Amino acid sequence: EDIRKKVPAYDLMLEIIFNSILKIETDISQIKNILSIGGQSFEVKNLSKIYNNSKITIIEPSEIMLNIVKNECKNLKNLEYIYDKFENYKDNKNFELCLCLLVLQFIEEPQSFLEKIYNSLDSNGLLIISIFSNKQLTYWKEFALSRGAKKEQVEKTFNNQSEVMNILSPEYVEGLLKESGFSKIERICEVLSTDMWVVRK
C-alpha cells in the first residue's frame, strides 16, 4: 500500500524471485525447509504455493507483526511460526532456502544477524536478500513523493535516514555478507536506493 509507494521495484523484485530466480536456483524436490525472515503475506503465500511439500518457518521482529501475517495466511498448511525474534531463535534446523526482503535496514546488529542466517543454511543453501540503501536518495525522494508517499515520512528518511533505519551502503552490505562466510554474492537488482542479491553459502 504505502510500502510500494516508498520502495522502487517492490513488485518487480518479488516477480523476479518467484518467476525466475527460484526456478533457476532451486530444485523443488531438494527444498525441505525454508526460512522466511520478516516476510509479508504475499511472499509467504508464494513460497507456500511453489514449495507445497516444504515446511516454511516464519520469523517476525514482533508478536504484532507475527499476528498480522498469521491472520493473512490462516488457511495455509505448511507454515511453522516462531514466537520470538530471529536474534533469539536457536534451532539446529538447517534450511536450503532463506528469504530476507527489506529487513536488514531495520536490524539492530546486522553482522551477527547475517552470520546466524549463514549458520542456519545448508551447505549449498540459497539466500535472497534485499535492502533499502543510502544511495541516490535525492532521486528516491522525488520518486516516492510522485507515488503519493507521505511528505513528512519522505523528508525524514531523506534528511535524517539514521532516525528511521540503518544507513546501509550496498558496498558495506556486500562486505557484511562476505564476512559472514558466503561464497557467492550476485547483485540482481539495483534501482535508486534499493538492492537485491542472490547469495550462496
Chosen residue from 138, 150, 167, 178 binding a second copy by CB under 8 A: 138
Binding to a second copy by residue 146, rule CB under 8 A? yes
Binding to a second copy by residue 192, rule CB under 8 A? yes
Binding residues for a second copy restricted to 9-38, rule: CB under 8 A: 9, 12, 15-16, 19-21, 23-24
CB of 181 to a second copy, least distance (A): 24
Pairwise CA distance, residues 128 & 177, whole Å = 12
Binding to a second copy by residue 136, rule CB under 8 A? yes
Tell how many helices (H) and how many strands (E) occur in the chain. 9, 7
User: Which stretches does DSSP call E strand in the chain?
Assistant: 33-37, 55-59, 79-81, 95-101, 121-132, 184-191, 194-200
Q: Which is nearer to a second copy, 66 or 191 (CB)?
A: 191
The C-alpha cell that represents 64 in the structure block? 504484532
The pairing of strands 194-200 and 121-132 is: antiparallel
Pairwise CA distance, residues 155 & 115, whole Å = 33
Chosen residue from 59, 104, 176, 191 binding a second copy by CB under 8 A: 191
Site residues for a second copy per CB under 8 A: 8-9, 12, 15-16, 19-21, 23-24, 136, 138-143, 146-147, 187-192
